[PDB]
Structures are given as structure tokens and as C-alpha cells.
DNA sequence: AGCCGTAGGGCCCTACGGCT
DNA sequence: AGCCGTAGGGCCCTACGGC
């Protein structure tokens, strides 16, 4: 992998460490091949702080660096046997590049500490504004970053060693709480000391993963990748009435315009939203192989096609009506939504799961009818308890159905935001004839791989870890649904074999609820009431802003129509005014003066076509106006009374509940 | 990789062979898990007719098939050991799916012949209009292709065994001539199944598709479908040299979606090549980021790169909007695409072409644009111009990598027959380096030669004592210096002797084997330099003739509209009252038409007229446009009435392109 | 040989948290 | 131990023809 230099005098030789071959190519073209070597790594390197020594010494990327430096590791480390006097870390000018830098400084600190001590370790500084060095032209990477005449390099300096020893243990170690504490105390919503560098770069990454990757927003229940996918579909008119659009086009559009990450991350997020076993209310409607419950992946994006589901329209409803705030995209060239209008409670409906830095999230799916009735009960009573809300919201409702054992785990999860929810498969004991029996599984727990589960039972039987099982078959079909058959030995108690399967296999899986969502852009552990309160505050805002916008637009349009009506009342005069004018400026000024018209009104008259002078067209102008006057009155009523605004929110949620609300799938047992 | 069925009774068991995991998923979801098994392959299978046994037996896909069937192969073939009584070939409903089918049948016929004799081999029939079984929903697949209650399976039948051996030999064999002769004899340009008929039809659909729609360039624009689709793709989305760079993935996805139903790398890599100044004599793509090197390094992932048209590409696309070329329906009928680009410069000869098809291959070298244009101007003035007179203009190929060409001999043979071997030599010098010692400095290498790989080949000869006198070898190439390969010479060793050996033993000297095959009326044809130029000129004459014809239609329509607005402004008051007293737009139309002697288009142009057109400046503006239009109409009719005038217009336009884009010759033709 | 360039097709290593 | 889901990064087999 190493693209070495001509020279063999380490004192003048430099080694540049890059993320992969895309950045490597630009680097090999722009460099000085006499004194500058290039080692392209393969993305994220191993965390030596969290890893076992054997794993470290056998890792291909760790080995490639050891071999290239020629200094050996730990105690056998000889700074004399070094092949470069500058080890230059040149990761990409993004948050994951900062993370790879922290992962590298950690390996150098725990294994090659004298390399830092000798001042041999540097950090390159490529221009921000690129996603990778592979986006840069060789001449651009050279002058800015690699030429010793123009480059700005940071030399890594280890000042206090005990402070550094505590830093690497805090940020890179296996104890989460210390990292969480560090993020909480520090989050904000030339030589360089290693401790400062590790703290600033790790906080850059942690923060970014927390607010812009792994955690959902409380208002719409979406993570940046899902929001950008849905918006991408909205922008391209990939609505349910239109035909399916190729996945490659959606992925490429979303990536180019909103998501500066790999295709794999975008396509896989899109695929999951299109799976009925993953989403309680699927957001994407996919044509083709979108994977299975057996862990089978979707077909490559060239084969599949997609569009929004009917319910996705409710997530994007009124986005163009000044309901939500837009922000600049990653490069300034595009505008993206900060949140979606979310006309149905998506956070609780589809749930969420995401591994962040210092924290994680695990919100289960819920039944739409129960959520809406929950939100409606809350609208009528701000003081409602979790117990009362539970009269509406019984508990989670998995797309895979099954059983939940007891309401105590649910109660605790809705009150504290944390709890263990015991899930069970739908299994029954039935006869197969000849005095023999079988166990028939028709519903498996949520997020459990059906094939992998069957293989675990197979494994237990083969290893004689369970008694009574004579056969095991997956009789699932498009036609009969999920059907897993476990044949029992004649005279053996099948209820005992079933109880054993529940203790030994994923046939019984628990769901550890950990309700962390972004509230006002900060991660917060929330309870059931809080999740709903935030959803309702959001809906009141969306509806109010839509009404304020529709009113501004209706007034602007009534204004224009008042001008067209004046023109229809004085057509000969209007014509004479335009005809007697040499320019469009003169006509516009003369019209404004003669008929007390605004600039907007006179431009509208000047833009009016001759076909608009016929009987039908004259009528259309009068009818649009009379309709709009009534519409302005209707809107002005909504903004004059807060109880009328709140009742519209309730009426709109009621319509959604009546159209999209479905039956409970998951049975809650006592 | 096999997803077997639960039943262990071969009689009721079926095995489906699919192209990969994308098709497998859809297949696995729709099937009857009790009776149907799925084996997903990994694309194109090995051709057993062209392979030796060590290779056949080491192949993962071949191995996976033998194991799943359990019958064994050749002499040890046992039909009783068959785990399935139905081996169903289920490749995608595309040309490549037909090729994979011929590849699978060749293996079954050569290694598992009794399995065909027994009637255990069948061919599935999925619907077309899908990109792969991975595009179909599971329920759709079961109904149309897998359900025994509704499917239509062809059972492979071996009729005449002597006839089959020859069909497998001719089509899949190592001798290219018999295969080429089969395509020449059978090509047409512009239930049980007989193995021979299946092989002949599927292989011919594949062969014809690679020839007319993949590997060979069109004589008129010099482009292959992928490149023409990329360039049309950029044109549609306005990714011109004046606009900013657009994301590589957005281009790739758009082109794949709308025009090219093929894999992503194929699109991106064709776009990358068109952007490389060492690949293209006149690059067609302007790229931002890592687009590869002469060292065989590939481009950065498409997520990193940005692209747009070069100024020269605007000349390839110039007049596409003006009815010059025939548009055709795309692969799925939802879009329209050009069959050929107007190509205002001779692209086939300028950038060359390199392609491996079925039964043939093409190898066309790049040329200097100033020379080519001068050659076309010469042929326009003299239809009977000889190849010898053309060579006064077109000296020989002119590589983007410069270098040297040894003699006019190979060039002359290639330009007269379309076939010749042209010796390409590196630009190499012998210079002193101090201490009474010398070195060989290489600054230009031959075309399509990987620099790093050539250096590795020289290093190899030195390590393996096959060359004497070399002491060191370095690549000193930089953005500052340009290509610079340094070979150190041992003190007192003859440096020219070392150099002459390096030419004889390494890519330092390479041969360009000219084989000028291009599509002519959609048919592969071996053309010489004159025929290439003749076909280019005729295409240009038609492009200009059609553009002229289009503008004349456009102007005459415009003049007719203006005649109506002229009448409307001369009677504005009666025009307004006519419209004011009309209940509907249709009534106004009919009224303006009868009263003022207007046509449907004229009456509609008046009804669409905005009130601002009634200002004083407008009636004068209209009479100005109408009068400059009459002059314009006259000019166009003059061009279309005299062919000499039309030909002079072609000459003029090519002379401009020559003065705007013509560059100096890079490659030196040394008389050796 | 093994390369040239458009085509078919897919796999595996890393981080990060909380649960088992 | 290892699985869940957004992220960093890349490789290798096959057909085809002409030297
Ligand atoms: C797969 O099975 C294997 C097996 C082994 C492999 N070993 C190494 C290796 F690097 C890869 C991956 C391969 O290198 C790629 C990487 C990204 C990939 N999509 C890019 C993209 C990004 C953005 C896009 C589109 N495509 N397509 C579009 O149409 C527009 O948007 C193109 C190449 C998909 O696979 C392997 N893949
Ligand atoms: Mn990166
Ligand atoms: Mn295919």
C-alpha cells in the first residue's frame, strides 16, 4: 500500500497518512516524490484503547504503519530505526477525519510514544470546503497543504503526560459515563498540545454524531439522513400518484444536494423505510428486492425503484407554506428543511434506534390510532398524567406483532423514559397426528433475524442443549405468512420444550427502551408525556405559520385581482394609457397615477393577456376574488382566537387518524 | 451460497440458477421453499470451451454448481446422484442474461451431457421490462415465472449431437473467424427448446448487441453508446463549461436512470476516461478532483469527483436542438435520446477508439485536429483525392502522450487498408550526471502504456540479470517537471546500447495495431482513412442541410405570426371589441379568423399577446423583426438552392473550429 | 502472458452504546 | 460475546479479440 519516496535520509523524508485511495491519488500526484511518502489507510482505524493486544498486533492497517515507520512498538521502539522525521496525519477536512485523527494519535500515544516526544508527529491542514482530498486537484493539494513553502503544519507536543494519560482514557476508553460527562460539560449548542488536540477533535465528532447523525428530532422523529431522503423525494415530485423512480437517481440527488456521505448510508436508510418488518408506518414505497426478515439485503440500487407512501405526504404536508425553517445545505448551493411539518407523531409511531457518542437511543414503534387519541387527550388537558395517557396508549406496537409480557416495563419506560419490555413470539402447540405434536411460531419479536433464530434452535438441538425436538422447518411463504414449525418427540411435553425455547433463544427478546431525542437541538432523555407535548407544541406552530402564510398570499392575490378588476371596469381608458406610452416604464407609471394602482397592480395589468378580456375569463377574475375574500375571512378567524387554532390542529389529527390509523398488532398480556 | 429446499426427494425438487444476490432475494421471497432451491451465481460464468481443466475445476461458481447437483462431472457423471430433476436457468431478461445462459449451457453440454439428454435442464421465462429479477416484486415473480400452475418453462432438448458439438465449437470456441462468419451470415441490421437453436439465437442476440450497441464507435460522431449518453446527459442538465462543476454521482444516476441501463462503474469510468488528458487527445469531460493517473491509479470514488463539459464538447453537441440528428426512444420508452451527435469536428479520428466486441475488435489512433480538418477541406475540394495527397495534411496519428513514431510505412498501410502496425517510441535522451557518469532521461512514454508498470518491468530485467549497465532507476515525475523517468548508467557502459535494449525488451517501445472498424449505417465495417473522412463529411453536409431546413421552417412560422400581429396592431380597437364581445376563447378565435383573415396560429398568438405589446415601441419593433426575418429567409433559401454554397458553409464552419481548437502536433514522426 | 475498455456480478474491515 | 444502524474506507472474479 505504501507509495514510498526516492530519498533514504529520514531527516528530510516525510510520510503522509491519508484515509484511502481516493485521497491518496490526489496526494501521489501533488507530492514531491523525492522526500514525500504516501500511506493510504482504509477509513476508520482500530481503537487501541478499547482493543485487546492480539487484535491490535494482527490488524492490517496497524501493521502497515509499524512496517512503514520501521521503529517497532512499545518497549522495542527505537527512534533511531525511524524512516521519516515527519509522520504527517492528513485526514479529510470533515468530522470523521477528526475522529480518524483521534484514533491515530491514540495508537501513536499507547505504542509509539517517543515518536510524539521527539516531535516527529504532525497534523496537515487541508482547506475546509472539501469532503475528501480526492475532490481536490493535485496542484490545489500541493500548494495549500504539502509544499514546505506555503503549508501550515501543527507539530504535536506532549506537555503533561499524566494529563494526557487521563485524556486518552476518558475519550477513547471503554467507560461511557466519563465521555458523556466530558461531552455535557464542553458541548456548545506552530505547536499543538496532544491533550488539546484530542479534546477538540473528539468533541467535534461526538457533537456532530449527536446533533447531526445518530439521534432523532422530537418534532418529526427523523435523523438527518431520513429527512434528506424524504425531502429529496418531495423535491423531485416522487409522490404516490406518480410512477416509481430509480433508486440510483434518488441516492445521487440526495448525496449531491444534501447528504455528503457514502451511497451505502443513504440507500440503506431508504431501504429500511420501505420495509414492512422494520417500519410500523413505512415511509418509502419500494419496487423490487428490498430485503427480508432473514437478514437478506436489498438488491443493488441499479435494480430497485422507489417513491413516497401516502402517509409520507402527511410528513411533508405544507412544507412550501412557511411552516418550517429552512437552512443552508453543507456547501451553500442548496436549501434544506431543519425539521419536517410532520402532520402525524412519527417519533413514537415508527420509533428510532441509534448509536451516538457517549449515548444511544431506543424508542419502540407505537399504534397511530392510540398516539393520535393520546395527543387529542393531551390537547384537552395540559395536566394529564402518564397513567391517563396510557388509557389511550396501551404500549408499543411492533410491525412484527407478537406479545409483550406485562405492563410494568411499559409503565416505567413511559414515566422515566427507560425500561425493559419483554417481547414474545406468537407460538402455539398443535397436533400433527399419530399422537405427536409441534410448536408453530407465526410472529417473531421485533428486530430478531428469523433465519439466525432458526439456526440458534438447530445449534441447541445439534449440541444436545435442548431435549424433545425431532424436526425444525421454516414454512414461511408470501401466501401463508411467517410459519416456523418445531416438531416435538412423541410423549414429550411441548409446553416445557416451548418454555425452554423462550429461555434459550431469541424467541423471547427484551426491548430496552432508552428515549433520547433532540429537544431544542440538545439530546434529552424524555418520557411519554414530554414526547407528545413537544409534538403538540410543533403542530400548533406548523398550523399557525401555514395560516399566517396563506393569509399573506391570499391578500397579495386579492390586491392583484383588485387591480385587474379596476382594469376590466375601465378597459378603453387602460388601453389608451398603454397605447399612448412609448415604453413599458411610461405605461406602468401613467397607469399607477391615472388609476391609483400599485407597481404590482400595474405590472399585472401590463402582463394581462388579450384572451383574459372574454366573458368567461372576466367572470373567473370576479369569482377568484369573491372566493379569496371569504378565504381571507376564514383565515383571519383562526388567528383571532387560540381555541379555534387548537381545534383545527385536533380536526386535522382526527382526519389523519381516520385515514391512516390501523389495528393494534402487538398483544399486551397480563 | 445455495438456499436449498426442505424436501429431499429429487423428483419433486427444482434448482433455480440466478445471476447474483439481487435476483436471489426476489427469487427466495417468491418461491416454494419446499420444492424450489436457489443458487445465485456471480455474473459472467467461465467459458468452459475456451478454458483448460485446472481453471474450470478451480472456479468457485463451477464448483458450487457441481456440489449442489451432486451428479459429478465427465466420466464420473451419475444421473441417479442428481439432487434435482429440474435445473432451471433463470438469468435476467437482457442481452447479458442471454450470454450467461449460453455460458451455462456450454458447461452443462461439456461436463454434464446426460443431464440434458434426460431433459432435467430447463430455461425460465421472466418478463422483460425489468433490469434484473431484483427489480421485480416477489409476488410478481412467483406468478409469472415460478408458480407451476402459471409458468412457461422451456425444456432443453439435444437433437443431433454432431450438430451441437459444432455449434458449441463455432460459437464458444477459441477460433474467432468461424464465430465472426456466423455473425456475418446471420446478423440482421436496422414447450421444448433445441439446444442448437437456443445457442444460435441467444449468442447472436448478445453478439449483435455488443457490436451495434456497446464496443464499436459510430463513424459519424466517433462515439460508443455510453459516451454519447454521458455527453447528452451533461447537455440536458446544462453542465456546460460556463456553469459550475456538477457532482459525479448526480450525472451517473441521471444517465443510468434515463439512458444507460447498465452498471455504475461502466458509466463513471467512461466519464473518467473522457476527462484524462493522457487518454484523450481532445478531452470531452472537465473534471474536478482525482480522475486517475498514467500509473494505472483509478479515479476517486464518484462521491468525491465533480464534472462538466469541455468547450470542445459544445462543438459535438452544437445544433442538436435544431433538427440535425434523428432522436429515438430510450430503453423503457419514457425518454428520448440522440442516435448520433451532430459532431461539428471529426471525433472518430481525433480522439480515436479502442474496443473489444464479439467476432471483432477496433483500434483507432487519435489524430491532430488541425491536420484532420485540413484533410476534410481537401476532400471537399476534390472527391477523387488519393490517400497519398491526404497524408500531406494528415501526417499520421498524434497521441495525447506525444512520443515518437518510427517511419511512415505502418501509417501508410493503416490509412490505405485500415490495418497497420505503427511503432511508438518514448522520447529518451542520454545526458551526463556527474563524476564522469551518464543517465537515460525518458520524458514522454507511448500511448496507453502504464508508466509505473513499465518502470516495474525495467526493474525486473535488472533484478533478473537480463539487462546489463543499469545502476539505478527513478520516477522523477511531478506537476512542475512533467513526466521524467531516470535510468542510471554504470560508469563506462555504453548508454545508447542500454537504451536500444530497453526499447527491444520493455514497453519503452510499443506497437499500435491499427484496426479501423466503425459502425457505418449501423453495420461494423473495416474502413480506411479516406472512407472515415468521406462518411464524416457526408454527416456534416446532412447536419448543416437539416439545420438550414429547420431555421427556414422556424422563420416562416415566425413571419406568419408577425403578419397576424401586424394586422392586430393595425385594428387594435376592433380586435379588443371582438374579444370583449366573445363569451369563450374559441368564439374569439373563430371571430378573429373570419374578420381579419387570420389562421388558427395567428388568432391564438393575438389572444396570448400581453397588454404591454400595445406600447408605441412595439408596432415598430414588429416591423423591424419581420423585415430582418425576410432577409434571413432569403439567405437560407440561397443555401438550400445551391449545393456548392451549402458545401462552402460546411468548409467555413470547420475552418472556424480549426482556428478555435486546432493545436500543435505532439508526436514526432521520425523517418527511420 | 496479460493488457486494453465496456459489460455481468458481489464482501469486509473499522467506531460507537447498551443490552444480552 | 455480538447485534443493532448510520458513518470512514476499499477489490476481485467473469466475457470478449489481437497482439
Ligand atoms: C458490492 O460487492 C463488493 C464486494 C467487494 C468489494 N470490494 C471492494 C470494494 F471497494 C467494493 C465496493 C465497490 O467499490 C463499490 C463501492 C461503492 C459503490 N457505490 C458507489 C456509488 C455512489 C453514489 C452513487 C452510485 N454509486 N450510483 C449512482 O447511480 C449515483 O450515486 C460503487 C463501487 C458500490 O460498490 C466491493 N463491493
Ligand atoms: Mn473521509
Ligand atoms: Mn443481470
mmCIF file of C-alpha atoms in Angstrom, chain A residues 111-346:
data_model
loop_
_atom_site.group_PDB
_atom_site.id
_atom_site.type_symbol
_atom_site.label_atom_id
_atom_site.label_comp_id
_atom_site.label_asym_id
_atom_site.label_seq_id
_atom_site.Cartn_x
_atom_site.Cartn_y
_atom_site.Cartn_z
ATOM 1 C CA UNK A 111 2.570 2.243 21.266
ATOM 2 C CA UNK A 112 4.954 4.781 19.704
ATOM 3 C CA UNK A 113 5.062 7.466 22.465
ATOM 4 C CA UNK A 114 8.765 8.533 21.843
ATOM 5 C CA UNK A 115 7.735 9.472 18.213
ATOM 6 C CA UNK A 116 5.498 12.267 19.683
ATOM 7 C CA UNK A 117 8.209 13.059 22.365
ATOM 8 C CA UNK A 118 10.783 13.522 19.538
ATOM 9 C CA UNK A 119 8.336 15.966 17.848
ATOM 10 C CA UNK A 120 8.156 13.641 14.753
ATOM 11 C CA UNK A 121 4.261 13.587 14.643
ATOM 12 C CA UNK A 122 2.488 16.373 12.704
ATOM 13 C CA UNK A 123 -1.052 17.270 11.562
ATOM 14 C CA UNK A 124 -1.570 18.582 7.980
ATOM 15 C CA UNK A 125 -4.126 21.343 7.293
ATOM 16 C CA UNK A 126 -6.083 20.935 4.007
ATOM 17 C CA UNK A 127 -8.815 23.522 3.138
ATOM 18 C CA UNK A 128 -12.153 23.144 4.636
ATOM 19 C CA UNK A 129 -14.782 23.163 1.968
ATOM 20 C CA UNK A 130 -13.911 19.794 0.541
ATOM 21 C CA UNK A 131 -15.453 16.395 1.626
ATOM 22 C CA UNK A 132 -12.236 14.484 0.813
ATOM 23 C CA UNK A 133 -8.758 15.186 -0.628
ATOM 24 C CA UNK A 134 -9.961 13.210 -3.713
ATOM 25 C CA UNK A 135 -12.227 16.222 -4.517
ATOM 26 C CA UNK A 136 -9.089 18.446 -4.771
ATOM 27 C CA UNK A 137 -6.874 18.781 -7.849
ATOM 28 C CA UNK A 138 -3.236 17.736 -7.261
ATOM 29 C CA UNK A 139 -1.946 21.364 -7.699
ATOM 30 C CA UNK A 140 -4.505 22.589 -5.115
ATOM 31 C CA UNK A 141 -3.455 19.927 -2.530
ATOM 32 C CA UNK A 142 0.222 20.728 -3.205
ATOM 33 C CA UNK A 143 0.235 24.469 -2.794
ATOM 34 C CA UNK A 144 -2.162 24.579 0.109
ATOM 35 C CA UNK A 145 -1.137 21.530 2.034
ATOM 36 C CA UNK A 146 2.074 19.832 1.039
ATOM 37 C CA UNK A 147 4.599 22.336 -0.149
ATOM 38 C CA UNK A 148 7.004 23.214 2.613
ATOM 39 C CA UNK A 149 6.959 26.839 1.220
ATOM 40 C CA UNK A 150 3.209 27.533 1.790
ATOM 41 C CA UNK A 151 1.900 24.784 4.133
ATOM 42 C CA UNK A 152 0.790 25.404 7.733
ATOM 43 C CA UNK A 153 1.685 22.352 9.884
ATOM 44 C CA UNK A 154 0.934 21.649 13.540
ATOM 45 C CA UNK A 155 3.676 19.886 15.468
ATOM 46 C CA UNK A 156 2.238 17.573 18.140
ATOM 47 C CA UNK A 157 3.626 18.384 21.620
ATOM 48 C CA UNK A 158 3.101 16.128 24.701
ATOM 49 C CA UNK A 159 3.295 18.559 27.676
ATOM 50 C CA UNK A 160 1.760 16.976 30.862
ATOM 51 C CA UNK A 161 1.923 13.114 30.461
ATOM 52 C CA UNK A 162 -0.407 12.259 33.432
ATOM 53 C CA UNK A 163 -2.979 14.776 31.971
ATOM 54 C CA UNK A 164 -2.571 13.055 28.530
ATOM 55 C CA UNK A 165 -2.806 9.561 30.113
ATOM 56 C CA UNK A 166 -6.167 10.629 31.747
ATOM 57 C CA UNK A 167 -7.371 12.258 28.444
ATOM 58 C CA UNK A 168 -6.838 9.174 26.235
ATOM 59 C CA UNK A 169 -8.536 7.019 28.942
ATOM 60 C CA UNK A 170 -11.518 9.411 29.139
ATOM 61 C CA UNK A 171 -12.212 9.977 25.389
ATOM 62 C CA UNK A 172 -11.043 6.646 23.996
ATOM 63 C CA UNK A 173 -11.624 4.200 26.859
ATOM 64 C CA UNK A 174 -14.473 1.756 27.469
ATOM 65 C CA UNK A 175 -16.126 3.799 30.283
ATOM 66 C CA UNK A 176 -19.027 5.665 28.574
ATOM 67 C CA UNK A 177 -20.089 7.851 31.593
ATOM 68 C CA UNK A 178 -16.730 9.748 31.637
ATOM 69 C CA UNK A 179 -17.119 10.557 27.895
ATOM 70 C CA UNK A 180 -20.782 11.569 28.443
ATOM 71 C CA UNK A 181 -19.697 13.885 31.312
ATOM 72 C CA UNK A 182 -16.944 15.374 29.080
ATOM 73 C CA UNK A 183 -19.421 15.995 26.195
ATOM 74 C CA UNK A 184 -22.020 17.552 28.591
ATOM 75 C CA UNK A 185 -19.504 19.911 30.309
ATOM 76 C CA UNK A 186 -17.947 21.073 26.994
ATOM 77 C CA UNK A 187 -20.732 20.972 24.349
ATOM 78 C CA UNK A 188 -21.768 24.346 22.798
ATOM 79 C CA UNK A 189 -25.210 24.390 21.073
ATOM 80 C CA UNK A 190 3.048 26.239 15.156
ATOM 81 C CA UNK A 191 2.965 23.636 18.028
ATOM 82 C CA UNK A 192 -0.225 21.940 19.310
ATOM 83 C CA UNK A 193 -0.611 20.064 22.606
ATOM 84 C CA UNK A 194 -1.874 16.456 22.127
ATOM 85 C CA UNK A 195 -4.442 16.792 25.040
ATOM 86 C CA UNK A 196 -5.904 19.954 23.466
ATOM 87 C CA UNK A 197 -5.971 18.239 20.025
ATOM 88 C CA UNK A 198 -7.613 15.046 21.363
ATOM 89 C CA UNK A 199 -10.256 17.062 23.316
ATOM 90 C CA UNK A 200 -11.159 19.495 20.447
ATOM 91 C CA UNK A 201 -11.264 16.823 17.675
ATOM 92 C CA UNK A 202 -13.201 14.262 19.761
ATOM 93 C CA UNK A 203 -15.712 16.930 20.837
ATOM 94 C CA UNK A 204 -16.105 17.914 17.138
ATOM 95 C CA UNK A 205 -17.034 14.298 16.216
ATOM 96 C CA UNK A 206 -19.148 13.493 19.348
ATOM 97 C CA UNK A 207 -21.276 16.654 18.919
ATOM 98 C CA UNK A 208 -21.785 16.084 15.165
ATOM 99 C CA UNK A 209 -22.890 12.419 15.665
ATOM 100 C CA UNK A 210 -25.267 13.506 18.493
ATOM 101 C CA UNK A 211 -26.983 16.561 16.792
ATOM 102 C CA UNK A 212 -26.466 15.659 13.111
ATOM 103 C CA UNK A 213 -26.400 11.869 12.619
ATOM 104 C CA UNK A 214 -27.438 9.221 15.253
ATOM 105 C CA UNK A 215 -30.301 10.886 17.195
ATOM 106 C CA UNK A 216 -33.840 11.740 16.052
ATOM 107 C CA UNK A 217 -35.553 15.107 16.425
ATOM 108 C CA UNK A 218 -38.521 15.088 18.858
ATOM 109 C CA UNK A 219 -40.755 17.137 16.454
ATOM 110 C CA UNK A 220 -40.566 14.885 13.308
ATOM 111 C CA UNK A 221 -38.861 11.683 14.602
ATOM 112 C CA UNK A 222 -36.267 11.756 11.791
ATOM 113 C CA UNK A 223 -32.456 11.648 11.664
ATOM 114 C CA UNK A 224 -30.710 13.925 9.054
ATOM 115 C CA UNK A 225 -30.327 11.048 6.559
ATOM 116 C CA UNK A 226 -34.076 10.173 6.615
ATOM 117 C CA UNK A 227 -35.147 13.834 6.444
ATOM 118 C CA UNK A 228 -32.923 14.476 3.415
ATOM 119 C CA UNK A 229 -34.268 11.293 1.704
ATOM 120 C CA UNK A 230 -37.930 12.280 2.233
ATOM 121 C CA UNK A 231 -37.242 15.921 1.191
ATOM 122 C CA UNK A 232 -35.278 14.625 -1.859
ATOM 123 C CA UNK A 233 -38.395 12.596 -2.840
ATOM 124 C CA UNK A 234 -40.607 15.682 -2.255
ATOM 125 C CA UNK A 235 -38.309 17.968 -4.362
ATOM 126 C CA UNK A 236 -38.298 15.521 -7.295
ATOM 127 C CA UNK A 237 -42.127 15.054 -7.181
ATOM 128 C CA UNK A 238 -41.729 11.300 -6.371
ATOM 129 C CA UNK A 239 -45.311 11.341 -4.870
ATOM 130 C CA UNK A 240 -47.517 8.149 -4.665
ATOM 131 C CA UNK A 241 -49.723 9.117 -7.716
ATOM 132 C CA UNK A 242 -46.645 9.263 -9.998
ATOM 133 C CA UNK A 243 -44.661 6.222 -11.206
ATOM 134 C CA UNK A 244 -41.669 4.683 -9.372
ATOM 135 C CA UNK A 245 -38.328 6.460 -9.828
ATOM 136 C CA UNK A 246 -34.986 4.650 -9.962
ATOM 137 C CA UNK A 247 -33.112 4.435 -6.567
ATOM 138 C CA UNK A 248 -29.767 5.466 -8.167
ATOM 139 C CA UNK A 249 -31.359 8.832 -9.201
ATOM 140 C CA UNK A 250 -32.718 9.441 -5.602
ATOM 141 C CA UNK A 251 -29.414 8.403 -3.922
ATOM 142 C CA UNK A 252 -27.329 10.589 -6.316
ATOM 143 C CA UNK A 253 -29.698 13.606 -5.926
ATOM 144 C CA UNK A 254 -29.833 13.346 -2.051
ATOM 145 C CA UNK A 255 -25.994 12.849 -1.869
ATOM 146 C CA UNK A 256 -25.148 15.611 -4.328
ATOM 147 C CA UNK A 257 -27.594 18.132 -2.800
ATOM 148 C CA UNK A 258 -27.954 17.302 0.940
ATOM 149 C CA UNK A 259 -26.031 14.304 2.270
ATOM 150 C CA UNK A 260 -22.179 14.405 1.970
ATOM 151 C CA UNK A 261 -21.724 10.761 2.910
ATOM 152 C CA UNK A 262 -21.400 7.404 1.174
ATOM 153 C CA UNK A 263 -24.163 5.966 -1.041
ATOM 154 C CA UNK A 264 -24.329 2.908 1.274
ATOM 155 C CA UNK A 265 -25.528 5.018 4.207
ATOM 156 C CA UNK A 266 -28.248 6.810 2.115
ATOM 157 C CA UNK A 267 -29.506 3.745 0.131
ATOM 158 C CA UNK A 268 -29.623 1.534 3.218
ATOM 159 C CA UNK A 269 -31.559 4.197 5.208
ATOM 160 C CA UNK A 270 -34.012 4.494 2.238
ATOM 161 C CA UNK A 271 -34.391 0.658 2.011
ATOM 162 C CA UNK A 272 -35.231 0.277 5.757
ATOM 163 C CA UNK A 273 -38.011 2.956 5.461
ATOM 164 C CA UNK A 274 -39.502 0.770 2.662
ATOM 165 C CA UNK A 275 -39.647 -2.459 4.798
ATOM 166 C CA UNK A 276 -42.931 -3.529 6.486
ATOM 167 C CA UNK A 277 -41.000 -5.577 9.089
ATOM 168 C CA UNK A 278 -38.856 -2.514 10.060
ATOM 169 C CA UNK A 279 -41.389 0.342 9.833
ATOM 170 C CA UNK A 280 -44.788 0.345 11.621
ATOM 171 C CA UNK A 281 -45.862 3.044 9.051
ATOM 172 C CA UNK A 282 -43.435 2.545 6.040
ATOM 173 C CA UNK A 283 -42.221 5.920 4.692
ATOM 174 C CA UNK A 284 -40.886 4.669 1.319
ATOM 175 C CA UNK A 285 -42.791 2.521 -1.197
ATOM 176 C CA UNK A 286 -40.230 0.285 -2.935
ATOM 177 C CA UNK A 287 -40.396 -1.591 -6.281
ATOM 178 C CA UNK A 288 -38.031 -4.591 -6.249
ATOM 179 C CA UNK A 289 -35.990 -6.641 -3.757
ATOM 180 C CA UNK A 290 -35.937 -4.579 -0.533
ATOM 181 C CA UNK A 291 -34.504 -7.316 1.676
ATOM 182 C CA UNK A 292 -36.080 -9.806 4.117
ATOM 183 C CA UNK A 293 -36.580 -10.832 7.797
ATOM 184 C CA UNK A 294 -33.731 -13.365 7.249
ATOM 185 C CA UNK A 295 -31.156 -10.542 7.037
ATOM 186 C CA UNK A 296 -31.074 -10.674 3.233
ATOM 187 C CA UNK A 297 -30.041 -7.335 1.844
ATOM 188 C CA UNK A 298 -31.806 -5.261 -0.778
ATOM 189 C CA UNK A 299 -30.823 -5.545 -4.441
ATOM 190 C CA UNK A 300 -28.110 -3.062 -5.655
ATOM 191 C CA UNK A 301 -29.582 0.435 -6.232
ATOM 192 C CA UNK A 302 -29.444 -0.068 -10.047
ATOM 193 C CA UNK A 303 -32.215 -2.713 -9.727
ATOM 194 C CA UNK A 304 -34.633 -1.168 -7.235
ATOM 195 C CA UNK A 305 -37.064 1.813 -7.601
ATOM 196 C CA UNK A 306 -38.999 3.880 -5.055
ATOM 197 C CA UNK A 307 -41.474 6.676 -4.185
ATOM 198 C CA UNK A 308 -43.227 8.094 -1.074
ATOM 199 C CA UNK A 309 -46.003 6.224 0.653
ATOM 200 C CA UNK A 310 -49.383 8.025 1.050
ATOM 201 C CA UNK A 311 -48.562 8.646 4.791
ATOM 202 C CA UNK A 312 -45.182 10.320 3.828
ATOM 203 C CA UNK A 313 -47.271 13.098 2.186
ATOM 204 C CA UNK A 314 -48.552 13.833 5.757
ATOM 205 C CA UNK A 315 -44.908 14.234 6.919
ATOM 206 C CA UNK A 316 -44.203 16.734 4.130
ATOM 207 C CA UNK A 317 -47.681 18.419 4.064
ATOM 208 C CA UNK A 318 -47.366 22.279 3.902
ATOM 209 C CA UNK A 319 -43.511 22.346 3.718
ATOM 210 C CA UNK A 320 -43.948 25.028 0.956
ATOM 211 C CA UNK A 321 -46.281 27.100 3.188
ATOM 212 C CA UNK A 322 -43.679 28.713 5.555
ATOM 213 C CA UNK A 323 -44.418 26.153 8.331
ATOM 214 C CA UNK A 324 -40.826 25.024 8.993
ATOM 215 C CA UNK A 325 -37.477 26.919 8.894
ATOM 216 C CA UNK A 326 -35.041 26.264 6.028
ATOM 217 C CA UNK A 327 -31.269 26.354 6.378
ATOM 218 C CA UNK A 328 -28.311 26.306 4.041
ATOM 219 C CA UNK A 329 -27.022 22.886 2.943
ATOM 220 C CA UNK A 330 -23.423 21.672 3.555
ATOM 221 C CA UNK A 331 -21.869 23.828 0.730
ATOM 222 C CA UNK A 332 -24.177 26.878 0.457
ATOM 223 C CA UNK A 333 -25.576 25.861 -3.011
ATOM 224 C CA UNK A 334 -28.862 24.379 -1.711
ATOM 225 C CA UNK A 335 -31.527 24.904 0.958
ATOM 226 C CA UNK A 336 -32.802 22.061 3.172
ATOM 227 C CA UNK A 337 -35.511 21.741 5.902
ATOM 228 C CA UNK A 338 -34.373 21.833 9.549
ATOM 229 C CA UNK A 339 -37.499 19.781 10.501
ATOM 230 C CA UNK A 340 -40.495 18.421 8.532
ATOM 231 C CA UNK A 341 -44.077 19.658 9.221
ATOM 232 C CA UNK A 342 -44.840 16.062 10.498
ATOM 233 C CA UNK A 343 -48.659 16.079 10.493
ATOM 234 C CA UNK A 344 -48.685 12.625 12.407
ATOM 235 C CA UNK A 345 -46.449 11.728 15.545
ATOM 236 C CA UNK A 346 -43.567 9.998 13.745
#
